[PDB]
Amino acid sequence: LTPEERSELKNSIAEFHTYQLDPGSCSSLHAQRIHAPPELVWSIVRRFDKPQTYKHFIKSCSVEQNFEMRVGCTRDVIVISGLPANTSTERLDILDDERRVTGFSIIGGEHRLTNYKSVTTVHRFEKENRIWTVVLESYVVDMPSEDDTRMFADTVVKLNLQKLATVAEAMARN
Amino acid sequence: LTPEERSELKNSIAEFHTYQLDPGSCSSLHAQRIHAPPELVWSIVRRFDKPQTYKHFIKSCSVEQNFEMRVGCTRDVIVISGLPANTSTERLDILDDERRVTGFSIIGGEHRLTNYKSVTTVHRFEKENRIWTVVLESYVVDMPSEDDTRMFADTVVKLNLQKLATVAEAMARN
Ligand SMILES: CCc1cc(NS(=O)(=O)Cc2ccc(C)cc2)cc(C)c1C#N
Ligand SMILES: CCc1cc(NS(=O)(=O)Cc2ccc(C)cc2)cc(C)c1C#N
Numbered sequence: 507l508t509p510e511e512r513s514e515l516k517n518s519i520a521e522f523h524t525y526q527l528d529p530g531s532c533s534s535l536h537a538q539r540i541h542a543p544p545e546l547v548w549s550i551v552r553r554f555d556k557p558q559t560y561k562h563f564i565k566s567c568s569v570e571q572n573f574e575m576r577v578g579c580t581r582d583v584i585v586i587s588g589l590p591a592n593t594s595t596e597r598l599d600i601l602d603d604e605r606r607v608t609g610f611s612i613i614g615g616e617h618r619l620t621n622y623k624s625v626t627t628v629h630r631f632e633k634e635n636r637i638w639t640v641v642l643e644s645y646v647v648d649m650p651s652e653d654d655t656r657m658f659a660d661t662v663v664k665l666n667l668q669k670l671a672t673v674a675e676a677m678a679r680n
Numbered sequence: 681l682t683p684e685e686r687s688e689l690k691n692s693i694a695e696f697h698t699y700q701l702d703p704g705s706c707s708s709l710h711a712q713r714i715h716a717p718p719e720l721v722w723s724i725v726r727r728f729d730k731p732q733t734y735k736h737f738i739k740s741c742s743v744e745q746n747f748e749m750r751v752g753c754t755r756d757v758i759v760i761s762g763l764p765a766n767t768s769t770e771r772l773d774i775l776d777d778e779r780r781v782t783g784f785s786i787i788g789g790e791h792r793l794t795n796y797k798s799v800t801t802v803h804r805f806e807k808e809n810r811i812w813t814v815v816l817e818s819y820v821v822d823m824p825s826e827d828d829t830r831m832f833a834d835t836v837v838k839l840n841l842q843k844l845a846t847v848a849e850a851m852a853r854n
Pocket of ligand 2: 737759793
């Protein structure tokens with residue numbers, strides 16, 4: 507992020523990305539610049555039922571019949587093979603279409619990320635005739651080894667933000 | 681382009697993209713912002729022998745055996761079907777690796793773009809911790825109808841600059 511971007515995001519970081527952090531947990535914040543309109547980036551990332559369309563490592567994701575996307579709905583993720591996780595059950599914790607804030611929590615499954623909770627926010631930037639997006643994503647998770655959990659989780663979040671960027675930029679081509 | 685980008689490119693436009701324009705010709709300048717390092721964009725676009733790797737509409741492109749990329753070498757392009765051209769023979773007019781300037785001329789083939797000549801230049805931008813590229817491409821061509829030639833040529837150049845952008849940005853992903 508540029509100094510101006512960090513300066514303009516300080517409010518959103520305090521509002522949506524601040525945690526009460528204890529030694530038993532680890533947590534981080536990551537950012538991704540996306541050269542696409544924020545309303546487009548948001549339309550992609552808000553689909554709690556289809557994380558495989560903007561994330562890596564998902565073999566399948568199922569939701570219940572007559573699914574309704576609202577707080578408390580869940581998704582059943584099966585991870586691709588060869589990762590430190592097999593399955594994950596996840597709950598939509600907040601969906602704020604007006605402020606472009608969403609977040610989820612892991613509530614079950616076979617994996618090593620107990621009490622994982624994540625928040626994603628999408629931000630509009632405008633300067634001269636330029637319009638672009640920054641996405642912020644933060645998480646908190648139990649810390650079982652200590653540096654490995656953070657290293658693994660950070661790399662996944664970064665790779666997934668990058669995939670979101672490629673999808674939105676593909677859609678935004680004139 | 682932003683006002684600052686246009687301001688910083690004014691020199692390069694005067695240096696490399698100015699033409700003596702007569703009513704029998706048409707000409708235009710187009711720009712493409714690319715979110716990748718300029719040395720990467722340049723390594724792609726300087727390959728006179730492989731335009732199909734950064735342009736649309738090319739069925740095949742052949743160069744002679746023991747090809748040497750230097751001024752006066754040629755390429756034999758076959759266009760995909762359904763366009764107002766079948767074949768084109770093109771000559772490398774200038775290759776300046778130090779200044780990132782290259783240009784070519786059409787010297788034969790079955791098409792409607794007689795005396796087409798093009799110049800492409802690649803420009804480094806740097807602000808705070810951001811590094812990005814702008815590519816400028818200009819052409820001059822005979823004007824046979826008058827608005828159609830410009831409309832066709834402009835749309836092709838714009839689409840090809842966009843393809844170059846997608847290729848370089850794919851390569852630049854962290
Ligand atoms: C393979 C990463 C992953 C994805 C996953 N589901 S998800 O991609 O739909 C949402 C997500 C959860 C946890 C992380 C670190 C990234 C993304 C669930 C788990 C338990 C893991 C692990 N390990
Ligand atoms: C199909 C566009 C095209 C490409 C082409 N060869 S090329 O793509 O390798 C370089 C090029 C030439 C002319 C234009 C307008 C764009 C690119 C030659 C011709 C005569 C045409 C036409 N019409």
